[PDB]
Amino acid sequence: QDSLSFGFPTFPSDQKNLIFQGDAQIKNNAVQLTKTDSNGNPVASTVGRILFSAQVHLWEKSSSRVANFQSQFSFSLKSPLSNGADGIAFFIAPPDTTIPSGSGGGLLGLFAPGTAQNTSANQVIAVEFDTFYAQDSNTWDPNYPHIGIDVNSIRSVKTVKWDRRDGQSLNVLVTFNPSTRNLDVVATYSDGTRYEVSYEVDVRSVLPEWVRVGFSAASGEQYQTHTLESWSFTSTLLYT
Amino acid sequence: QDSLSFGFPTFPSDQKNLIFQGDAQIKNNAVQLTKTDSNGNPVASTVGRILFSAQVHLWEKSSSRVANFQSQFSFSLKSPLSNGADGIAFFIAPPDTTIPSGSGGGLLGLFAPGTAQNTSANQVIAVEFDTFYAQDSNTWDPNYPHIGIDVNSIRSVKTVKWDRRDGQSLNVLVTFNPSTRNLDVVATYSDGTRYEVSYEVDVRSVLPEWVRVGFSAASGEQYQTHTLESWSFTSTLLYT
Numbered sequence: 513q514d515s516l517s518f519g520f521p522t523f524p525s526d527q528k529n530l531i532f533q534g535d536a537q538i539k540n541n542a543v544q545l546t547k548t549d550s551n552g553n554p555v556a557s558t559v560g561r562i563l564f565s566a567q568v569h570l571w572e573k574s575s576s577r578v579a580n581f582q583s584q585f586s587f588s589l590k591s592p593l594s595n596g597a598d599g600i601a602f603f604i605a606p607p608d609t610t611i612p613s614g615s616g617g618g619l620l621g622l623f624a625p626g627t628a629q630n631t632s633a634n635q636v637i638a639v640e641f642d643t644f645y646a647q648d649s650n651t652w653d654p655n656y657p658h659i660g661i662d663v664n665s666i667r668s669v670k671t672v673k674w675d676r677r678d679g680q681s682l683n684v685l686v687t688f689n690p691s692t693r694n695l696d697v698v699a700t701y702s703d704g705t706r707y708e709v710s711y712e713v714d715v716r717s718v719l720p721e722w723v724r725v726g727f728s729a730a731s732g733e734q735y736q737t738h739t740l741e742s743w744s745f746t747s748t749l750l751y752t
Numbered sequence: 753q754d755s756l757s758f759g760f761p762t763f764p765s766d767q768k769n770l771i772f773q774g775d776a777q778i779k780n781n782a783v784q785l786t787k788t789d790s791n792g793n794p795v796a797s798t799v800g801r802i803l804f805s806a807q808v809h810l811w812e813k814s815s816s817r818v819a820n821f822q823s824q825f826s827f828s829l830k831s832p833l834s835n836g837a838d839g840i841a842f843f844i845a846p847p848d849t850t851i852p853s854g855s856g857g858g859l860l861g862l863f864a865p866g867t868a869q870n871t872s873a874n875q876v877i878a879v880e881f882d883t884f885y886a887q888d889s890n891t892w893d894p895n896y897p898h899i900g901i902d903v904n905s906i907r908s909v910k911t912v913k914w915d916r917r918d919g920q921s922l923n924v925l926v927t928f929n930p931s932t933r934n935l936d937v938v939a940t941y942s943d944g945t946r947y948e949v950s951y952e953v954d955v956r957s958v959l960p961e962w963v964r965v966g967f968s969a970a971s972g973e974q975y976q977t978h979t980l981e982s983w984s985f986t987s988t989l990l991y992t
């Protein structure tokens with residue numbers, strides 16, 4: 513289809529169109545990307561992702577069209593630790609994408625350690641909300657919590673300073689305009705605090721014509737829950 | 753998801769979200785539900801159907817919600833003869849539905865011969881565009897071409913006389929309003945000729961909470977092509 517749209521105001525336990533990978537699962541009408549014990553407390557060494565089952569037609573070589581898409585979602589992070597890790601990401605990848613071996617911790621379940629910074633060995637666009645930046649392990653990160661745009665590498669092509677707020681929902685709108693090739697990110701907390709970051713990228717040179725979209729999160733030595741609360745997505749092929 | 757929508761202005765050959773059953777296949781940016789020969793002419797004894805891969809949440813028992821839905825599509829029928837058969841139908845059925853054994857000809861690939869008229873043995877709602885009504889084989893049909901609403905039986909609960917026009921596209925709009933429980937069908941040719949038929953039905957007592965939607969077509973000893981040219985669908989769970 514040239515256009516596809518779906519909306520999850522909440523996530524009831526009865527799901528049919530979500531692909532669950534790793535430890536991801538539904539609890540209390542929300543998606544818990546990373547594992548939690550019986551008490552609902554976060555635990556270390558966990559990775560989880562979800563993808564919508566239907567494939568998205570991102571662009572079409574035969575007609576020179578590229579999709580205009582929007583992804584709106586909200587999530588919250590919680591941890592008893594002073595440095596909860598590692599973060600959550602909205603991503604776009606080839607339909608057959610699976611969790612790479614050893615992609616936990618700072619790799620967010622998106623990259624393998626051996627090629628995490630080799631832009632030639634990956635095919636993924638992701639918007640990350642990174643809460644762990646120890647300069648000793650996450651050597652690629654700026655020294656502060658941040659929102660980042662990742663294009664084939666865990667070393668973001670761009671980041672902006674972000675404030676982690678325990679237990680508070682962050683609302684995010686990610687949009688891509690094929691005319692300007694601008695990928696825009698706007699995130700806000702309920703008190704009006706706003707974060708914005710934009711990057712120009714030709715998706716045709718990074719991803720295949722058909723892709724799958726979803727979320728990924730992970731915790732290494734440090735942990736926190738990564739709870740996806742809602743998600744709506746829409747894409748339509750346009751002439752350029 | 754509470755809401756889902758998709759649109760196929762045309763049908764390019766590289767489809768990823770369609771389930772093809774029987775003889776259905778893509779040819780000339782359109783879906784040819786029934787088999788044709790090397791030169792594009794319809795052949796006898798053929799059945800074919802397509803279903804969208806993503807499941808639709810038609811109703812939810814927990815929240816007591818029922819979805820409204822709208823399906824818009826266009827198709828054309830062509831045959832060397834004039835007594836083309838057997839027809840095409842838009843249908844909604846359980847997710848695991850498959851072509852019943854011996855469901856060709858007048859059963860449109862939707863029902864099995866032994867239980868075609870047993871409402872307690874089927875789970876399907878369909879809107880049929882029936883072009884063959886010979887009483888020797890299609891004993892359940894009115895004696896003329898027609899559009900009918902089928903609920904668990906090949907014997908339509910409601911029909912309206914219709915005119916088959918070789919090679920001309922018919923634009924169809926099917927709508928279900930959960931508030932009134934009315935399933936409305938509006939079909940029109942480009943010259944404005946309009947056909948309407950509606951019926952009140954409680955989908956909750958006929959279909960499961962999750963379903964798949966698609967089209968089915970068949971030809972028995974008489975034949976014609978059943979070409980699906982475009983299709984858009986949208987559904988949203990609502991509180992009535």
Ligand SMILES: CO[C@H]1O[C@H](CO)[C@@H](O)[C@H](O[C@H]2O[C@H](CO)[C@@H](O)[C@H](O)[C@@H]2O[C@@H]2O[C@H](CO)[C@@H](O)[C@H](O)[C@H]2NC(C)=O)[C@@H]1O
Pocket residue numbers: 556557558597598614615616617618619625644646648649650731732733734735
């Ligand atoms: C206290 O933890 C810090 O210090 C120790 C020791 O120096 C590091 O080992 C820690 O690094 C691990 O944990 C952080 C925080 O969760 C992650 O950001 C790091 O990535 C790292 O986690 C490992 O990451 C690799 C990939 O680089 C994974 O393959 C591996 O599975 C992860 N380990 C675990 C136990 O999950 C931190 O700086």
Ligand SMILES: CO[C@H]1O[C@H](CO)[C@@H](O)[C@H](O[C@H]2O[C@H](CO)[C@@H](O)[C@H](O)[C@@H]2O[C@@H]2O[C@H](CO)[C@@H](O)[C@H](O)[C@H]2NC(C)=O)[C@@H]1O
Pocket residue numbers: 796797798837838854855856857858859865884886888889890971972973974975
């Ligand atoms: C000339 O054809 C008409 O008269 C003969 C002789 O009585 C019937 O056999 C024909 O019936 C078959 O063809 C029509 C038109 O295509 C269908 O509408 C009928 O359903 C029938 O086709 C068979 O239908 C059964 C289901 O009831 C299928 O199991 C069977 O496969 C179909 N036959 C074929 C060859 O496909 C018609 O009245």
Ligand SMILES: [Ca+2]
Pocket residue numbers: 598618642643644645650653
């Ligand atoms: Ca990090």
Ligand SMILES: [Ca+2]
Pocket residue numbers: 838858882883884885890893
């Ligand atoms: Ca008939």
Ligand SMILES: [Mn+2]
Pocket residue numbers: 640642653654658660666668
């Ligand atoms: Mn980072």
Ligand SMILES: [Mn+2]
Pocket residue numbers: 880882892893894898900906908
């Ligand atoms: Mn009929």
